[PDB]
Design an enzyme around this catalytic site. Structure first.
Site, PDB file in Angstrom:
ATOM      1  N   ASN B 231      -1.236 -27.448  27.436  1.00 42.68           N
ATOM      2  CA  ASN B 231       0.100 -27.847  27.511  1.00 42.68           C
ATOM      3  C   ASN B 231       0.783 -27.716  26.130  1.00 42.68           C
ATOM      4  O   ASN B 231       0.019 -27.866  25.167  1.00 42.68           O
ATOM      5  CB  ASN B 231       0.288 -29.293  27.652  1.00 42.68           C
ATOM      6  CG  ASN B 231       1.859 -29.644  27.393  1.00 42.68           C
ATOM      7  OD1 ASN B 231       1.859 -30.304  26.296  1.00 42.68           O
ATOM      8  ND2 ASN B 231       2.901 -29.972  28.282  1.00 42.68           N
ATOM      9  N   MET B 475      25.756 -21.790  -2.236  1.00 40.23           N
ATOM     10  CA  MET B 475      26.845 -21.463  -1.190  1.00 40.23           C
ATOM     11  C   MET B 475      26.391 -20.349  -0.333  1.00 40.23           C
ATOM     12  O   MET B 475      25.565 -19.670  -0.750  1.00 40.23           O
ATOM     13  CB  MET B 475      28.320 -21.015  -1.914  1.00 40.23           C
ATOM     14  CG  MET B 475      29.466 -21.366  -1.008  1.00 40.23           C
ATOM     15  SD  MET B 475      29.829 -22.942  -0.485  1.00 40.23           S
ATOM     16  CE  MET B 475      31.119 -23.228  -1.562  1.00 40.23           C
ATOM     17  N   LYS B 933      19.457 -22.940   5.387  1.00 41.87           N
ATOM     18  CA  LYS B 933      18.278 -23.376   5.440  1.00 41.87           C
ATOM     19  C   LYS B 933      17.871 -23.830   6.813  1.00 41.87           C
ATOM     20  O   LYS B 933      17.747 -24.812   7.386  1.00 41.87           O
ATOM     21  CB  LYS B 933      18.303 -24.707   4.736  1.00 41.87           C
ATOM     22  CG  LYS B 933      19.521 -25.527   4.661  1.00 41.87           C
ATOM     23  CD  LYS B 933      19.824 -26.504   3.668  1.00 41.87           C
ATOM     24  CE  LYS B 933      20.953 -27.201   4.011  1.00 41.87           C
ATOM     25  NZ  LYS B 933      21.264 -28.280   2.854  1.00 41.87           N
ATOM     26  N   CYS B1098      39.341 -25.409  -3.252  1.00 38.79           N
ATOM     27  CA  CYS B1098      38.019 -24.601  -3.742  1.00 38.79           C
ATOM     28  C   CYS B1098      38.383 -23.279  -4.164  1.00 38.79           C
ATOM     29  O   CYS B1098      39.294 -22.671  -3.711  1.00 38.79           O
ATOM     30  CB  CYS B1098      36.981 -24.840  -2.802  1.00 38.79           C
ATOM     31  SG  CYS B1098      35.690 -23.758  -3.226  1.00 38.79           S
ATOM     32  N   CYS B1104      28.167 -26.418  -6.273  1.00 36.76           N
ATOM     33  CA  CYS B1104      28.114 -27.712  -5.441  1.00 36.76           C
ATOM     34  C   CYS B1104      27.277 -28.407  -5.736  1.00 36.76           C
ATOM     35  O   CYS B1104      27.434 -29.659  -5.948  1.00 36.76           O
ATOM     36  CB  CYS B1104      28.326 -27.092  -3.889  1.00 36.76           C
ATOM     37  SG  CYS B1104      29.637 -26.171  -3.478  1.00 36.76           S
ATOM     38  N   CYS B1109      32.017 -29.717  -9.459  1.00 34.29           N
ATOM     39  CA  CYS B1109      32.829 -28.964  -9.204  1.00 34.29           C
ATOM     40  C   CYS B1109      34.242 -29.244 -10.069  1.00 34.29           C
ATOM     41  O   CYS B1109      34.698 -30.164  -9.967  1.00 34.29           O
ATOM     42  CB  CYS B1109      33.360 -28.821  -7.988  1.00 34.29           C
ATOM     43  SG  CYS B1109      34.140 -27.594  -6.956  1.00 34.29           S
TER      44      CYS B1109
HETATM   45  C1  LIG Z   1      30.059 -27.137   1.345  1.00 34.57           C
HETATM   46  C2  LIG Z   1      29.380 -27.253   2.912  1.00 34.57           C
HETATM   47  C3  LIG Z   1      28.698 -28.113   3.403  1.00 34.57           C
HETATM   48  C4  LIG Z   1      28.309 -28.178   4.584  1.00 34.57           C
HETATM   49  N1  LIG Z   1      27.364 -29.120   4.965  1.00 34.57           N
HETATM   50  C5  LIG Z   1      27.062 -28.841   6.219  1.00 34.57           C
HETATM   51  C6  LIG Z   1      26.262 -30.148   6.827  1.00 34.57           C
HETATM   52  O1  LIG Z   1      25.885 -30.984   6.076  1.00 34.57           O
HETATM   53  N2  LIG Z   1      25.322 -30.058   8.032  1.00 34.57           N
HETATM   54  C7  LIG Z   1      25.536 -28.996   8.831  1.00 34.57           C
HETATM   55  O2  LIG Z   1      25.111 -28.746   9.847  1.00 34.57           O
HETATM   56  N3  LIG Z   1      26.373 -27.664   8.194  1.00 34.57           N
HETATM   57  C8  LIG Z   1      26.807 -27.787   6.963  1.00 34.57           C
HETATM   58  N4  LIG Z   1      27.734 -27.029   6.551  1.00 34.57           N
HETATM   59  C9  LIG Z   1      27.818 -25.545   7.450  1.00 34.57           C
HETATM   60  C10 LIG Z   1      28.827 -25.791   8.529  1.00 34.57           C
HETATM   61  O3  LIG Z   1      28.505 -26.796   9.251  1.00 34.57           O
HETATM   62  C11 LIG Z   1      29.051 -24.327   9.263  1.00 34.57           C
HETATM   63  O4  LIG Z   1      27.935 -24.272   9.961  1.00 34.57           O
HETATM   64  C12 LIG Z   1      29.210 -23.060   8.381  1.00 34.57           C
HETATM   65  O5  LIG Z   1      30.058 -23.591   7.182  1.00 34.57           O
HETATM   66  C13 LIG Z   1      30.085 -22.068   9.426  1.00 34.57           C
HETATM   67  O6  LIG Z   1      29.843 -20.852   8.480  1.00 34.57           O
HETATM   68  P1  LIG Z   1      31.231 -20.511   7.432  1.00 34.57           P
HETATM   69  O7  LIG Z   1      30.554 -20.482   6.089  1.00 34.57           O
HETATM   70  O8  LIG Z   1      31.595 -19.087   7.667  1.00 34.57           O
HETATM   71  O9  LIG Z   1      32.274 -21.499   7.582  1.00 34.57           O
HETATM   72  C14 LIG Z   1      28.154 -26.893   5.517  1.00 34.57           C
HETATM   73  C15 LIG Z   1      29.182 -25.862   4.913  1.00 34.57           C
HETATM   74  C16 LIG Z   1      29.549 -26.022   3.477  1.00 34.57           C
HETATM   75  C17 LIG Z   1      30.256 -24.700   2.970  1.00 34.57           C
HETATM   76  S1  F3S Z   2      35.107 -25.769  -5.663  1.00 39.28           S
HETATM   77 FE1  F3S Z   2      33.942 -24.663  -4.137  1.00 39.28          FE
HETATM   78  S2  F3S Z   2      32.191 -23.386  -5.069  1.00 39.28           S
HETATM   79 FE2  F3S Z   2      31.587 -25.229  -4.695  1.00 39.28          FE
HETATM   80  S3  F3S Z   2      31.675 -26.844  -6.318  1.00 39.28           S
HETATM   81 FE3  F3S Z   2      33.514 -26.986  -4.951  1.00 39.28          FE
HETATM   82  S4  F3S Z   2      32.616 -26.188  -3.019  1.00 39.28           S
END
Ligand SMILES: Cc1cc2nc3c(=O)[nH]c(=O)nc-3n(C[C@H](O)[C@H](O)[C@H](O)COP(=O)(O)O)c2cc1C
Ligand code: F3S
Ligand SMILES: Cc1cc2nc3c(=O)[nH]c(=O)nc-3n(C[C@H](O)[C@H](O)[C@H](O)COP(=O)(O)OP(=O)(O)OC[C@H]3O[C@@H](n4cnc5c(N)ncnc54)[C@H](O)[C@@H]3O)c2cc1C
Ligand code: SF4
Ligand code: SF4
Lengths: 236, 1468, 117, 117
Positions: B231, B475, B933, B1098, B1104, B1109
């Site tokens: 299993n 980012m 990640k 932003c 970040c 920021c």
């Molecule tokens: C600043 C920031 C914080 C985010 N925090 C989370 C999070 O806490 N949990 C999560 O599942 N995804 C998080 N995401 C990813 C978004 O949920 C989503 O999957 C992603 O932004 C979509 O792709 P995009 O960059 O084109 O918007 C985060 C994204 C950004 C930019």
């Molecule tokens: S301005 Fe944008 S690049 Fe990061 S520190 Fe704030 S989300």
């Protein structure tokens, strides 16, 4: 190395108008060394830098900013003068309130722009004093004839680049003093002629040929200049 | 889903064993997936001994005289649709059996009843028959079985030689028989009536109920196999197959003979992973070893460097690790030889195993505990199986063997300590020998040849030398894919790292390094069937990464056995120079290995202005594949010296290809050149190299753990990657088994790139490296997706409402040269354009977009609130994230502002989850991984968490919070189904949603989750943003969302399951064209995310994680938060503009809504560039269209999916006096193990009516008799009491919030309370508040992620209180291993009796001492007194009686960060 | 299945490229499954086309002979992996074959490609 | 308007509590008897009888952002605008029609040029 969190923007200096009203030299003083180490520490290395995209030469600002923040002024000077010619005067004359220091993300967030022009001036000042500057003379001279008209900034930069390539450059001008209108058009009140004389002597040391007090309209003409060289540059 | 086994301890066969096996299989209907047809199943099986009396009676009735010795029965599956193939199979098997002079009695057709099988499985039913074989030669039974096995192998080969499909020998033997099929679980005894005679009897019986992943069945792939019943899954299935194919060439034993030549390819083709495990298991067992021996040699125990284990076991572990590569993965094995019967677990111990011993000499083991009915007056001991442990029964002598005694009996046989000491480890060999440099110009020239930057080089390498940890990004990625990148890129960018999502959860390398080992062996490959001292004679290295000194030591140790191979090609060569160089090095390596030399070392030091360097990846791949195909790899180790590798990803991809050790020297000389100028401060070069090696080790461990592989020896050469943009022939010839869904550049393009780079490097006179623009934007090159002008255009257009400016924005974005896949697709139609007024209203489109979740820890509360307000204002669904939500937001404001979040998340952390937090929603979302990640889970920095964050997440202020990578309650797809059941129970009106990341092989996962009663799938792209993450994980992890979306849509409409789900995507959706193309590909909803942030203020500063920021989006300091500029109207304007753009595109196309375009893939075409010289990327597999048939391409159903009702219904009807008057109620019931989620719907009702703290403790009281199913009392609010007499299965108290749960053995139990397991694994997962007084032992990962609850238990398993944050835990008895891992909050009191705590406990972030203050002593006394009052535990009372001397018996454990935050110092 | 399709594609590609001909690309044949009965739609395989160009500048007869050798080698190789239901209908530069399990009256409505001028 | 009148009354909601945007050309009787809290904004032109019986609401007419016309030199609404309104506002940009704001009492209207009576 962010810095801008708690520190504050502070210009180099400014002489009060009580005695400034009578001199003809510059009103700004050289940047202090520790003030240089502090103010350089103010940028945040903004990804997708707006500071570069607005500077019309688009030199690598955050790199030498970080360097000057940490030291190694030789590396920083090299990476500064790599892509920008005439930095001593460009960092002093250009209106940074709308070109480079007018779009730094720190200023856009109303915190206060990092003094980019002042750091440019500083890094170009101490570099020349201790003598980390050599004329960019070529090796294995190609061998041809090229000439420019007008000793202005455009013509001088073109001549510097061509001499670095390995051509034979010829400079023509109407005025008796070289260097375009930096020695005649721009008032000494905003730029001392000493640095322009230093730069033009450095340029002459590279192997640049001068023809002072000439005119293309009366003394010569376009067929003559064209036949005398391979190609002619017009920066009149 | 599950295994089980029953065995007679004494060893006398009877009917009771088979009867109990059937009874156990009759009660596993609730784990497996439920079908609405009521007929179809996943496939079940049973395995017993041969009832010789039945077959003797049969052959006697036929007419023959029954022979006096044992008979043999062989079960076969033959084709049914045809007649001629049956004759061929019969003549084949008959001639192969009669080739050995044996005697054939006859065939037998099995009566069945095919009316219960569904119509989908009845289509592929094989004719099932049996054959009877005697023994006329009078040979021994061991030789009988061996001859039967050889005959089976030869029959398989011969029938493979005729391509006769659908023929399978179930089990040909004289001892055992196997009844398996594709029916349900319960109906087994109605399909095989032969199991209903009173003559069937066996002293052992194994049974399995599997969990399929695709709607299509297959009979020959149902458990149990010919010698096994497994299993779980297998993480390392490619590496093990390759290494076994290497080992095949040197396996010889006199036990087989000449017929050994027939058994060359032991691992057949087209079998499941467990099939290969079974076949290699049988091959090894028939050699002579005993079943426990081979079990310990295949799935060994995790070797730890502790003192709790004796030295004989240590020598045994070293020997088994040196013999054969392990087989990692979640596995609960129940295996059987002819003599032994063994049951055990893997290294990690993920899947559970619980057994019971009765007075009648009967042992019953299985995945669940309340399967069979046993009186309380017959049991003796109930036990569980920990990590790597094993329980065996010996049938000959009739004995039982537990872990320690079985290990001792195994170590008794051979002198291991006289063989292991024949090894050699290179620590003193290099240390003693060590005690017995280039120009900057040439260095710069070489770096320019390989194209290393200057800024980025000292930006990602500097933390590795100074700090020793890889840098952290900020980012998402937006650089183009490798094939479309204009400037030069290395080979390593074309390889993406894999990661497992649900089918097998990852392992946390930050807290479970004890099961992690990077040891490597040189000169250990030998015969797998021979045992001698000569085997353990080799070289051992503690780390595969080597510096220059260690490499010189190894090389000049090997001496003359080495053979260098030049890896350079002539620059002046023609167009086909690279292929010629490859052939040259392959021939040279083969000839060198044939010439006695047994070690090969690749080198490219001869690089200069005349010869260019072959890429290292391609070179080692070609060499390793050639050595495997030439049957010579088993004689030679492979080393590579690369001059390009700088970061951990390069080493990972160089090792995965098949290398063993690497010494990237150029990094070392660059580091030395950096240090000689005095840049690292005062650090000597030795410390620098040490930190570099340590950082690389940690990064490689992370990349390995990202897919659940704990042993390096099995990951080596497995080829666990994905190629995106390489030609099919190239990766299919000169690379291991790796799939490239779209073809890419071949050999000419790579040669052109390397040549142009070499020319621009050496042929000129360079001085300094380019500035580099990979990680950050620079004016030099490396085009990005978001530049300055486009950002300013978007911001001005959204703040000025000028829709013309937004059109100019869209034209500016779409005008850029190709950077993504979605920029290579054009769209056309055939009908006439339709005016824009006929297109559906804007609001019906705006209500489709959603805002992906963003944790409140990442960005300031202002941005979160603004997003929520805007999205809930336009009518769409916003998202909350992982950081929870403030309760004061659960009501609309006075100005009509709705600040709540409409979509709630259930992530791997369970930070803010709460019974009240799950009812303020419309849809719940499950988080598996995201695009940045995918393996390591979300993390939050130290200085970010404020006091408000600590209140939201129930934690300690100012501490680094990192979420555990794997969902501790999702270790298999069955766990996923159970969790969806739980969520739909606790919320009676919300929807559930999974969240995946696009990668290859996602189709089976899609089908599984669709079968798991889910509602909405979420394919997240590889370019999404994040708060913080490692840089390499940002740049080289994931796949474009187009690939995943197309694959999921195809595999999900092929199985006729499209009309029950709703697909939704996000990631890089900037303008309307992308949305329209995604809707065409199969999407139904859309998430924008990062773009919206830029509309809020932003400016993509990419800081970040630094809490600075400058605009004020992602910060927690108060000053920067004042600099906010957003407004709820800008997001509204952005969404309106997007909707209008999509409307315009659709009107110009010729349609009237997105409903008529979803799935119409034929609208698209692929255009390409002419003179780009890139070998055309065939996008057809993504544009391929599969016809759904009658079901619409987007068809869906209103309302959530259905679900059968548990006991809770019967509970909420009787408790109506409470819900109508508030009167106390007390109930009792009989609960079987089938009923799941007991006492949850009542929690939801009482939360919606009164709240959480609305009732006094003990308002409603419930008593249960028997054994409760898994997830007992999930989210039990305050005011409910649940007392169960018996034992709980697992997950008891998951997400407990204020309730009170008590378990106890019934009064008729003659057992000791503190020596018997009563509850299972991961008790109190993410508990927030309440009490749990248990009476008995606990399973694995006790009180993991506990924060606030008060728990008192008697014993525990390994990894207890893993990642604890709050609450009180009182363990009375022995603790497991690696106790208190990463604990950060709360306090623990362990009952010491042997002073053995310091050997087990982890002193990373906690300190232990004796009880000091009388205050904590009085609190502990109060806890014990309440525990005695609740369950009347006798042993607890006896502990209470001797207080004066038992006070100084306990040990107190407290976190290293709660010392100075305490109100009363614990230490005087 | 889908992974078997990838194995078949890479087999035919690595066997065609072993001679020197340059591949132009694939093409999915647009069909209309609705006119298929029930016993036939249960075992209907995927139909695809491949386009190859003769860039070696060779005569037609060597081209035909080389394509024949390629077809035989591909069949042998794919038989080496025991993959099921893989059939090259016709691979040449002189003729093409459209065959199926449909009726005789619906052929032109199964493969609409045959309705172009 | 009737629904919100039954729910919150005449003046139950603060101004601008719910806003609607209309593209194109509105029909007759735009916003007939709209209570306080509603806001209508039309981009284009209204036909006739716009704002009849207005009581507390808010109407806004304006040429769209790409208009090459001149605001104060064209017609944008119809006749008998705001026939017997009680309270509310009406901001427009353009010449109204005849019988503009007849029997008005309490409303606040701002128009660029109008007609007779
Ligand atoms: C600043 C920031 C914080 C985010 N925090 C989370 C999070 O806490 N949990 C999560 O599942 N995804 C998080 N995401 C990813 C978004 O949920 C989503 O999957 C992603 O932004 C979509 O792709 P995009 O960059 O084109 O918007 C985060 C994204 C950004 C930019
Ligand atoms: S301005 Fe944008 S690049 Fe990061 S520190 Fe704030 S989300
Ligand atoms: C702070 C600041 C202040 C400024 N102040 C001024 C100001 O006061 N005045 C101003 O004009 N700009 C001013 N500028 C602008 C800037 O200085 C000029 O635009 C720039 O220097 C012109 O460069 P150029 O290439 O035309 O060189 P120029 O110096 O204009 O080159 C012309 C040269 O060619 C010679 N020449 C002209 N005609 C002929 C011919 N027919 N044949 C041969 N040689 C010929 C001239 O004598 C002269 O030497 C200022 C800028 C800044 C930032
Ligand atoms: S001005 Fe701003 S964006 Fe430019 S380098 Fe300085 S901090 Fe970075
Ligand atoms: S002041 Fe300096 S940075 Fe600004 S535009 Fe001039 S040269 Fe560039």
């Amino acid at each position: 190395m962010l810095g801008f969190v708690h520190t504050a923007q502070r210009m180099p200096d400014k002489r009060p108008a009580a005695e400034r009203r009578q001199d003809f030299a510059e009103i700004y003083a050289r940047f202090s060394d520790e003030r240089a180490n502090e103010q350089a520490n103010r940028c945040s290395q903004c990804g997708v830098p707006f500071c570069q995209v607005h500077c019309p030469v688009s030199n690598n600002i955050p790199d030498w900013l970080k360097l000057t923040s940490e030291g190694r002024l030789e590396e920083a000077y090299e990476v500064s003068q790599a892509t920008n010619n005439f930095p001593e005067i460009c960092g002093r004359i250009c209106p940074q309130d709308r070109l480079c220091e007018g779009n730094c993300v720190i200023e856009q967030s109303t915190h206060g722009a990092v003094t980019i022009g002042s750091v440019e001036k500083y890094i170009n000042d101490t570099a020349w004093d201790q003598g980390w500057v050599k004329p960019r003379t070529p090796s294995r001279e190609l061998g041809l004839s090229v000439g420019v008209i007008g000793a202005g900034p455009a013509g001088l930069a073109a001549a510097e680049e061509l001499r670095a390539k390995g051509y034979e450059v010829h400079v023509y001008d109407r005025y008796d003093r070289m260097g375009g209108l930096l020695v005649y058009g721009i008032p000494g009140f905003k730029l001392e002629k000493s640095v322009v004389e230093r730069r033009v002597k450095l340029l002459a040391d590279a192997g640049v040929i001068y023809h002072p007090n000439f005119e293309v309209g009366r003394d010569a003409s376009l067929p003559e200049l064209r036949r005398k060289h391979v190609a002619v540059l017009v920066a009149t | 889903c599950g295994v089980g086994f029953i065995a007679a301890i004494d060893g006398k066969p009877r009917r009771s064993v088979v009867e109990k096996g059937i009874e156990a299989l009759k009660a596993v209907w609730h784990r497996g997936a439920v079908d609405a047809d009521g007929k179809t199943g996943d496939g079940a099986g049973i395995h017993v001994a041969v009832p010789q009396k039945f077959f003797k009676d049969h052959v006697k009735v036929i007419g023959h005289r029954a022979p006096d010795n044992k008979l043999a029965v062989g079960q076969v599956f033959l084709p049914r649709i045809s007649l001629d193939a049956q004759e061929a199979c019969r003549c084949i098997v008959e001639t192969e059996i009669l080739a050995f002079g044996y005697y054939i009695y006859g065939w037998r057709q099995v009566p069945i009843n095919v009316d219960i099988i569904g119509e989908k499985a009845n289509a592929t039913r094989p004719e099932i028959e049996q054959i009877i074989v005697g023994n006329n030669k009078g040979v021994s039974d061991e030789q009988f079985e061996l001859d039967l096995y050889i005959i089976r192998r030869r029959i398989e080969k011969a029938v493979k030689g005729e391509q006769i499909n659908d023929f399978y020998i179930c089990s040909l033997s004289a001892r055992s028989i196997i009844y398996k099929g594709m029916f349900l679980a319960e109906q087994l005894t109605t399909f095989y009536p032969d199991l209903l005679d009173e003559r069937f009897e066996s002293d052992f019986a194994i049974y399995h109920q599997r969990y399929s992943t695709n709607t299509f069945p297959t009979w020959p792939l149902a458990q149990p196999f010919r010698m096994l019943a497994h299993n779980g899954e297998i993480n390392t299935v490619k590496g093990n197959v390759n290494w076994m194919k290497a080992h095949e060439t040197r396996m010889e034993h006199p036990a087989f003979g000449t017929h050994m030549q027939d058994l060359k390819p032991v691992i057949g083709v087209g079998l499941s992973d467990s099939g290969s495990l079974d076949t290699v298991f049988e091959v090894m067992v028939r050699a002579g070893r005993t079943a426990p021996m081979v079990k310990m040699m295949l799935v060994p125990q995790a070797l730890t460097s502790s003192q709790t284990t004796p030295d004989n076991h240590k020598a045994l572990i070293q020997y088994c690790n040196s013999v054969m590569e392990p087989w990692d993965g979640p596995a609960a094995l129940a295996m059987t030889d002819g003599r032994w019967v063994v049951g055990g677990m893997d290294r990690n111990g993920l899947r559970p195993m619980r057994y019971t011993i009765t007075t009648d000499g009967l042992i019953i083991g299985g995945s669940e505990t309340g399967m069979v009915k046993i009186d309380e007056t017959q049991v003796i001991e109930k036990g569980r199986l920990g990590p790597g442990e094993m329980i065996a029964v010996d049938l000959q002598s009739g004995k039982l063997y537990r872990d320690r005694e079985l290990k001792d009996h195994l170590a008794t046989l051979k002198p291991w300590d006289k063989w292991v000491q024949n090894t050699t480890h290179l620590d003193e060999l290099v240390k003693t020998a060590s005690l017995k440099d280039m120009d900057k110009a040439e260095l710069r020239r070489r770096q320019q040849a390989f194209g290393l930057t200057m800024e980025d080089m000292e930006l990602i390498l500097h933390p590795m030398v100074e700090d020793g940890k890889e840098a952290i990004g900020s980012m998402g990625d937006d650089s183009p894919i490798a094939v479309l990148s204009d400037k030069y890129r290395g080979l390593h960018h074309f390889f993406r790292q894999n990661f497992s999502q649900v089918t097998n959860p990852p392992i946390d390398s930050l807290r479970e390094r004890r099961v992690m080992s990077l040891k490597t062996r040189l000169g250990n490959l030998g015969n797998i069937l021979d045992e001698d001292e000569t085997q353990t004679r080799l070289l051992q290295l503690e780390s595969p990464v080597l510096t220059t000194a260690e490499f010189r030591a190894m090389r000049d140790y090997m001496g003359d056995t080495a053979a260098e191979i030049d890896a350079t090609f002539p620059v002046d060569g023609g167009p086909e120079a690279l292929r010629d160089a490859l052939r040259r090095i392959r021939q040279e390596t083969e000839d060198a290995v044939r010439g006695g030399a047994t070690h090969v070392i690749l080198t490219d030091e001869a690089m200069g202005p005349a010869r260019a360097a072959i890429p290292a990846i391609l070179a080692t791949g070609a060499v390793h594949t050639h050595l495997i195909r030439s049957n010579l790899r088993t004689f030679t180790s492979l080393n590579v010296r690369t001059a390009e590798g700088l970061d951990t990803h390069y080493f990972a991809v160089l090792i995965g290809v098949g290398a063993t050790t690497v010494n990237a020297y150029l990094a070392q000389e660059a580091i030395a050149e950096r240090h000689r100028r005095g840049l690292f401060g005062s650090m000597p070069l030795e410390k620098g190299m040490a930190n570099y090696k340590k950082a690389i080790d940690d990064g490689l461990l992370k990349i390995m753990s990202k897919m659940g592989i704990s042993v390096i020896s099995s990951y080596r050469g497995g080829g666990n990657f994905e190629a995106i943009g390489l030609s099919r022939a190239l990766v299919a010839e000169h690379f291991p088994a790796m799939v490239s869904r779209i073809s890419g550049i071949g050999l000419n393009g790579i040669q052109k790139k390397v040549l142009e780079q070499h020319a621009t490097a050496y042929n000129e006179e360079v001085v300094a490296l380019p500035v580099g623009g990979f990680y950050r934007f620079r004016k030099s090159g490396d085009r990005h997706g978001w530049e300055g002008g486009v950002i300013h255009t978007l911001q001005q257009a959204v703040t000025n409402d000028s829709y013309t400016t937004f059109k100019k924005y869209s034209e500016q974005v779409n005008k850029r040269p190709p950077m993504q896949l979605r920029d290579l697709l054009e769209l056309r139609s055939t009908k006439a354009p339709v005016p824009v007024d006929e297109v559906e209203s804007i609001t019906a489109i705006r209500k489709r977009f959603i805002t992906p979740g963003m944790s409140m820890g990442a960005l300031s509360p202002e941005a979160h609130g603004t997003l929520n307000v805007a999205m809930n204002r336009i009518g769409a669904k916003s998202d909350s994230g992982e950081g929870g939500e403030d309760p004061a937001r659960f009501r609309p404001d006075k100005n009509g502002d709705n600040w709540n979040s409409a979509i709630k998340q259930v992530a791997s952390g369970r930070f803010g989850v709460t019974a009240e937090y799950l009812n303020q929603c419309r849809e719940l979302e499950i988080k598996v991984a995201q695009g940045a990640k995918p393996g390591e889970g979300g993390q939050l920095p130290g200085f970010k968490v404020t006091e408000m964050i600590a209140r939201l997440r129930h934690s300690t202020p100012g501490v680094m919070l990192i979420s555990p990578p794997p969902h501790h309650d999702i270790y298999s797809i069955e766990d996923l189904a159970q969790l969806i059941y739980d969520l739909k129970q606790i919320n009676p009106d919300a929807k559930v949603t999974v969240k995946l990341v696009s990668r290859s092989g996602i189709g089976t996962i899609a089908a599984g989750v669709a079968k798991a009663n889910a509602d909405i799938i979420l394919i997240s792209g590889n370019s999404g943003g994040t708060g913080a993450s490692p840089q390499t994980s940002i740049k080289f992890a994931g796949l474009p969302w187009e690939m995943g979306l197309s694959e999921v849509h195809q595999v999900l409409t092929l199985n006729r399951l499209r009309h029950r789900v709703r697909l939704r995507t996000d990631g890089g959706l900037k303008t309307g064209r992308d949305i329209v193309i995604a809707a065409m590909l199969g999407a139904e909803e859309f998430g924008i995310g990062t773009a919206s942030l830029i509309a809020m203020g932003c400016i993509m500063v990419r800081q970040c994680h630094s809490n600075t920021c400058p605009v004020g989006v992602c910060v927690q300091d108060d000053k920067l938060r004042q600099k906010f500029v957003g407004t709820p109207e800008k997001v509204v304007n952005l969404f309106t503009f997007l909707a209008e753009e999509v409307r315009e595109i659709l009107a110009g196309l010729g349609f009237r809504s997105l409903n008529e375009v979803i799935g119409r893939t034929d609208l698209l075409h692929q255009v390409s560039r002419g003179a780009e010289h890139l070998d055309d990327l065939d996008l057809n597999p993504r544009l391929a269209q599969v016809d759904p048939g009658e079901n619409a391409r987007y068809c869906t159903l209103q309302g959530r999916n259905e679900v059968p009702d548990t006991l809770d219904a019967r509970i909420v009807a009787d408790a109506r006096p409470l819900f109508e008057e508030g009167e106390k109620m007390q109930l009792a019931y009989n609960a079987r193990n089938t009923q799941r989620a007991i006492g949850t719907r009542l929690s939801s009702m009482v939360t919606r009516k009164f709240g959480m703290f609305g009732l006094q403790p003990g308002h409603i009281t419930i008593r249960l008799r028997g054994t409760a199913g898994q997830s007992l009392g999930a989210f039990a609010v305050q005011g409910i009491k649940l007392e169960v007499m018996g034992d709980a299965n697992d997950y008891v108290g998951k997400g407990l919030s204020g309730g009170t749960i008590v378990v106890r053995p019934t009064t008729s139990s003659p057992l000791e309370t503190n020596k018997n397991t009563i509850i299972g694994n991961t008790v109190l997962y993410g508990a927030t508040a309440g009490k749990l007084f248990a009476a008995g032992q606990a399973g694995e990962r006790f009180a993991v992620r506990n924060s606030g609850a008060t728990v008192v238990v008697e014993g525990c398993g390994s990894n207890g209180c893993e990642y604890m944050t709050g609450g009180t835990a009182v363990i009375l008895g022995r603790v497991g291993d690696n106790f208190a891992a990463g604990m950060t909050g709360g306090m623990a009191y362990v009952y010491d009796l042997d002073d053995s705590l310091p050997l087990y406990i982890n002193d990373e972030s906690v300190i232990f001492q004796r009880i000091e203050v009388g205050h904590y002593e009085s609190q502990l006394k109060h806890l014990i007194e309440e525990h005695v009052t609740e369950t009347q535990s006798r042993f607890a009372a006896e502990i209470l009686n001797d207080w004066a001397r038992e006070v100084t018996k306990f040990w107190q454990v407290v976190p290293k960060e709660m010392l100075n935050r305490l109100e009363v110092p614990v230490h005087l």
